[PDB]
């Protein structure tokens, strides 16, 4: 009856290799410059630059070949190497695949395989019919080897011939032309520049000569290179430091030139084709074009994220392709690819996947290097220890929630992700972001935070919900004070009510309630009202103290008011609170700590058994239908018939969920249809012979009262979220940002010739 299928996309793919800098972007612009080809972790999207739409999508699942192969794309080359809309995809292991865009995908692509002995393919590049491949083999520093790649038509095989080798490569970059390679080694360090297809350029020199004497006197941030760029001509080489200082070196005589604007680590450098301009970017979220003739600079500030990579793309520098990072979300690395028009610096094309914020860091994500070790960044020392600590936490520790809050708009079926201090509105039918709106105050896009400012925490959108009608948006925010002050521990809790006409795309704040439920009292649960009461124009907010407040929208006052209140000032605290409302609206089920209460809405007090004591704290209380009520505790899940007041079925959850999730996240793992049934979702780590970073999740469809399991299905990766679309199907989110769905004649020759001409 039910079936699972992946629908939406995932994160854009990146060359996630530490050594290579400035070559992280793999997306390629067509030779006609009419469309941008971007690889995702699960597909390849072709966007038309002129119209700003995804004209084509090549999904790995559809092809048997790509499904078997997809590993990550290391590069895309326009045309086919073996031989007008072909692309050659090189994967890290060595699979070379010739695909076609602008047409119908062929089920038998010209698959090949380069033969490499314990080498991981890192990069490939060409100038005119000549191809070289760079490969990585194994002091914790990887070594590199450069081969020449040729295709012999007779054998139809790719032959690789060794050309060169370097050891202990720390940082590496390739010119825009692809004909020069600059790299830094520990042979403290030495920088060497090599021509790739010729022997014309071959130079090497220690970093100490380039470094200034004062730099030798100062801290290690001043001696730590974070970026490197090489000009096409090879006459100039830019080195960026963790201090924020850029040094251009004249290779002929090793003369130095200092450019100093960045206050924090410079993350990306790129030269112009003529070499007369230098693009620089870092933590300021500002892109700087340094005019090298007069040493001047032009700015593009208030970008969406910190600039990981910069490039000038075109025969005439028509475009700037930037990679942005959005370091606010520590739970994941959120890359956004931005193609700007050089003439007016307007976004020609911005591409990103969904941006969930999970509870904890996932897999092997590491924060970008900064001058200092902050919450959003790592220091130069902190990187290795943080990586070890991340692995050790994912192995040893027992709390493995990685669960994310997601909302669905009943009217539009748009998917709302509460990013930190903002909301991303994402259309999973089109698999494209529709909006990004800031819903809180704070230092959001006023400036780029650097150094100590990077320890500031912007207000966090902890809950976001829609009314059943869908015309109203309810948001709950926690604003944090700055540190090192008397009021450095008084969190502020804010509630906001927004309205939006269906035609427009921007929500408008209609009411703001500061410190609802008192001072320093969190709003642990929010529940919009049913259609019966106020025509869905109301909601309940519930505390960790057992307080309940009912807000409703009053037409005369024209805005929301606290219609009802019940403030039992309990002297105990518990974040395990759950709320359910009967579809008739007469009764409200309020579960606090380990006790469930049935409160009459009209009196807004206990019904006149409404007390139900449970084994453990209630994480979720939901009613599949008017009759049955499903209550999940920390040890079990129970189906209680309200009409009989008896448990029909009880399932043991302790083996799978004992201390994995914080209280309240079972709510976002357990979802419920209003017609057919509900779903339970259970994740388990996979281990063979100590726990491993891999996870496997399983979905269970349950009928009303949990008598039977309609469907039992398995997904091969951690499912952060699962919720019920307002259709029959359920949408679930997986930590690779993947949204799956579980659901039920001479004239003819003349015409042809005229068309050809």
């Amino acid at each position: 009856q039910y079936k699972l299928s992946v629908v939406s996309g995932g994160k854009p793919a990146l060359n996630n290799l530490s050594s290579v800098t400035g070559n992280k972007n793999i997306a390629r612009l067509s030779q006609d410059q009419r469309n941008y080809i971007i690889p995702f972790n699960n597909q390849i999207k072709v966007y038309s630059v002129e119209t700003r739409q995804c004209v084509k999508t090549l999904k790995f699942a559809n092809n048997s070949l790509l499904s078997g192969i997809f590993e990550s794309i290391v590069k895309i080359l326009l045309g086919d190497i073996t031989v007008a809309h072909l692309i050659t995809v090189f994967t890290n292991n060595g699979h070379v695949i010739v695909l076609n865009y602008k047409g119908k995908l062929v089920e038998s692509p010209k698959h090949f395989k380069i033969s490499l002995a314990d080498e991981k393919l890192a990069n490939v590049f060409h100038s005119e019919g000549n191809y070289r491949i760079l490969t990585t083999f194994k002091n914790s520093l990887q070594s590199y080897r450069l081969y020449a790649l040729t295709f012999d038509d007779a054998k139809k095989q790719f032959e690789v011939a060794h050309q060169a080798e370097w050891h202990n490569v720390i940082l590496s970059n390739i010119s825009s032309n692809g004909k020069l390679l600059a790299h830094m080694c520990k042979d403290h360090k030495s920088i060497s520049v090599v021509s790739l297809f010729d022997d014309s350029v071959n130079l090497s020199f220690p970093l100490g000569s380039i470094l200034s004497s004062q730099t030798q006197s100062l801290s290690y941030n001043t001696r730590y290179v974070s970026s490197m760029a090489i000009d096409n001509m090879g006459q100039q080489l830019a080195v960026g430091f963790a201090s924020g200082v850029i040094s251009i070196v004249s290779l002929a005589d090793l003369q130095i030139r200092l450019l100093k604007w960045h206050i924090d680590s410079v993350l990306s450098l790129s030269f112009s084709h003529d070499g007369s301009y230098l693009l620089s970017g870092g933590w300021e979220k500002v892109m700087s074009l340094w005019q090298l003739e007069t040493n001047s600079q032009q700015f593009l500030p208030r970008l969406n994220g910190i600039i990981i990579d910069c490039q000038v793309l075109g025969p005439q520098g028509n475009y700037y392709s930037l990679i942005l990072q959005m370091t606010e979300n520590n739970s994941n690395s959120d890359y956004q690819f931005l193609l700007l028009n050089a003439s007016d610096l307007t976004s020609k094309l911005s591409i990103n996947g969904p941006l969930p914020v999970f509870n904890s860091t996932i897999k092997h994500i590491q924060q970008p290097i900064s001058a200092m070790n902050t919450k959003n960044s790592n220091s130069i020392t902190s990187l290795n220890h943080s990586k070890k600590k991340q692995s050790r936490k994912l192995i040893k520790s027992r709390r493995q929630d990685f669960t994310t809050n997601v909302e669905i708009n009943p009217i539009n079926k748009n998917l709302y992700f509460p990013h930190i201090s903002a909301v991303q509105i994402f259309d999973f039918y089109k698999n494209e972001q529709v909006n990004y709106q800031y819903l809180t105050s704070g230092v959001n896009n006023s400036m780029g935070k650097v150094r100590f400012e990077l320890n500031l925490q912007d207000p966090i959108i902890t809950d976001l919900k829609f009314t059943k009608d869908g015309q109203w948006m309810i948001t709950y925010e926690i604003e944090y004070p700055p540190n090192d002050l008397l009021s450095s521990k008084d969190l502020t809790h804010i509630l906001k009510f927004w309205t939006k006409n269906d035609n427009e795309t921007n929500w408008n704040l209609k009411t703001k309630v500061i410190n609802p439920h008192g001072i320093s009292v969190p709003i642990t649960k929010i529940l919009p009202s049913p259609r019966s009461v106020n025509n869905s124009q109301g909601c309940l907010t519930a505390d960790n103290n057992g307080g309940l407040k009912f807000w409703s929208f009053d037409s005369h006052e024209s805005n929301w008011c606290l219609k009802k209140i019940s403030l039992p000032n309990f002297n105990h605290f518990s974040n395990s609170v759950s709320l359910a409302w009967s579809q008739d609206g007469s009764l409200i089920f309020h579960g606090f700590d380990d006790k469930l209460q049935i409160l009459d809405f009209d009196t807004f007090k206990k019904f006149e058994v409404s007390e139900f004591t449970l084994d453990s704290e209630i994480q979720t209380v939901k009613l599949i239908n008017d009759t049955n009520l499903i209550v999940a505790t920390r040890t079990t899940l129970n189906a209680i018939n309200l009409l009989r007041g008896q448990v029909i079925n009880s399932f043991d959850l302790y083996p799978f969920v004992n201390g994995v999730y914080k209280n309240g996240h079972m709510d976002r793992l357990i979802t419920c249809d209003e017609r057919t049934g509900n779903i339970a979702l259970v994740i388990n780590q996979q281990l063979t012979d100590v726990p491993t970073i891999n996870y496997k999740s399983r979905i269970i469809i349950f009928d009303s009262d949990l008598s039977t399991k309609l469907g039992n299905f398995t997904h091969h990766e951690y499912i952060s979220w699962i919720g019920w679309n307002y259709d029959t199907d359920f949408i679930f989110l997986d930590i690779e940002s993947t949204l799956g769905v579980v659901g039920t004649s001479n004239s003819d020759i003349f015409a042809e010739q005229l068309h050809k001409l």
């Binding site: 593009l300 208030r302 105050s441 704070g442 896009n445 320890n455 002050l485 008397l486 009021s487």
Partner: protein
């Protein structure tokens, strides 16, 4: 790239009536008894004072016509519906009809009675007939053509009749209120001279007006009551007034957020606005030097600046007014494509906002404490700097000379509740950073001494407020 966010720094019915800012005060030779507005443009209003009637230009707010023929005191200046004529009553009992804006010629002079004629009002539906109420206690209904005998002579009032009203959409009905406390309704279609019925007010009725076709609101004694003709009983009654309410006016379908307004004079110096859509509840009020005898507001179709007029027994007249390259102009109406890419410049920033935008933390703090600086706006810049994490940074390069402006405000801002928490943060930091300089600076010491006395005073207030809070909980 996104545009830089801008720094983020009563009732609608009240806000509208706040707009009658311009107040002009005039002196009359005697008490102004009646005020009436011309129904037509320019909607000039006529004030009856002493032995003359003066008409005031709406735009100029100055007298344009004076009718000084009256030998004794005049008691009315009501216009006809079309605004050409105005009728006035005299203590001698003579009612005189003049053409508006033509004081010389007298169209019609009628001797209603030998007793004073206090009320002379034109019938709203019918232009021909004029109503007169005298101390004779008979409200004769005259016709301009028949100047020698009234068309009808309503009677039945056992005391002075000083109020007469015509119910809209009911030309046959006539309402009269006497000092008996009775409001009498008459039918001119029938024989008349006997009321259809009487409504009891229990206090002398000083003015009666028909708010709507079915609702009539009468002000007598210390309250005004709204009566429904269909049910013949008072729906509602308001007694917020302290003295005896004297006059009341009603304006409907004017451009305010509130559809209709009921103005009522009080004789305590108060004239207040009542909203008929919300059960005749108070929404506005004005206070004057002395008792108010007459009130008027410009009609609905004012077509210009609106006027609110108050009449006082001392003769004062108070007016509040709500004031209402040959191809450069082509605009491309004949062209295929029209491209508009111009962007308006952002609204002017202040000095402190410019400093924050340019990362001038120390200078932004200086702009906070400048002479003539709004206290709320001073609190924003202090909150912005805290939010940016720049509180110590703003306070490094400072000495006693440039620290006193901050401490002076903190000395006053600690008293305010909103700024109390912010003052604690800033004062805590400056002490932690400038402990040593304070020892060597005598002036900085006394600033802290008076700061310690005030913060001690605030502690007593907050402790006190807790005790009343405990008291209040006990009562409930």
């Amino acid at each position: 790239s996104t545009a830089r966010p801008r720094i983020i720094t009563t009732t609608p019915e009240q806000r509208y009536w706040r707009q009658y800012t311009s107040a002009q005060l005039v002196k009359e030779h005697n008490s102004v008894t009646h005020i009436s507005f011309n129904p037509q443009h320019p909607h000039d209003f006529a004030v009856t004072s002493s032995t003359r009637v003066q008409i005031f230009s709406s735009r100029t707010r100055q007298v344009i016509k004076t009718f000084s023929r009256f030998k004794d005191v005049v008691y009315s200046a009501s216009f006809r519906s079309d605004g050409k004529l105005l009728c006035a009553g005299d203590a001698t009992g003579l009612v005189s009809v003049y053409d508006s804006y033509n004081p010389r010629t007298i169209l019609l002079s009628i001797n209603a009675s030998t007793h004073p004629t206090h009320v002379t009002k034109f019938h709203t539906q019918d232009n021909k007939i004029l109503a007169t109420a005298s101390d004779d206690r008979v409200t004769r209904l005259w016709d301009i053509s028949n100047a020698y005998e009234p068309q009808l002579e309503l009677t039945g009032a056992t005391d002075y009749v000083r109020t007469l009203s015509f119910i809209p959409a009911a030309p046959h009905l006539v309402a009269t209120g006497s000092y008996d406390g009775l409001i009498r309704l008459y039918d001119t279609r029938s024989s008349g001279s006997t009321p259809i019925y009487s409504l009891n007010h229990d206090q002398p009725v000083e003015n009666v007006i028909a708010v709507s076709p079915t609702q009539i609101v009468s002000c007598g004694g210390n309250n005004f009551k709204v009566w429904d003709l269909t049910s013949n009983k008072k729906l509602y009654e308001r007694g917020n007034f302290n003295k005896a309410v004297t006059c009341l006016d009603y304006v409907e379908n004017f451009d305010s957020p509130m559809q209709s307004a009921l103005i009522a004079s009080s004789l305590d110096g108060h004239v207040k606005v009542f909203d008929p859509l919300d059960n005749f509840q108070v929404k506005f009020g004005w206070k004057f030097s002395g008792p108010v005898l007459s009130c008027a507001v410009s009609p609905s179709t004012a077509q210009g600046n609106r006027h609110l007029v108050a009449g006082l027994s001392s003769g004062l007249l108070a007016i509040r007014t709500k004031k209402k390259m040959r191809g450069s102009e082509y605009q491309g109406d004949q062209e295929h494509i029209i491209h508009n890419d111009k962007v308006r410049s952002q609204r002017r920033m202040r000095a402190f906002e410019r400093n924050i935008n340019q990362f001038k933390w120390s200078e932004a703090l200086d702009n906070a404490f400048v002479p003539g600086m709004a206290k709320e706006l001073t609190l924003t810049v202090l909150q912005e700097l805290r939010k940016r994490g720049k509180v110590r940074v703003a306070l490094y390069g400072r000495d006693e000379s440039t620290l006193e402006p901050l401490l002076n405000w903190c000395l006053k801002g600690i008293e305010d509740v909103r700024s109390a928490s912010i003052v604690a943060d800033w004062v805590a930091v400056v002490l932690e950073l400038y402990g040593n300089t304070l020892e060597s600076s005598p002036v900085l010491q006394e600033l802290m001494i008076d700061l310690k006395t005030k913060v001690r005073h605030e502690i007593h207030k907050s402790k006190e407020a807790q005790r009343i809070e405990g008291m209040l909980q006990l009562l409930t």
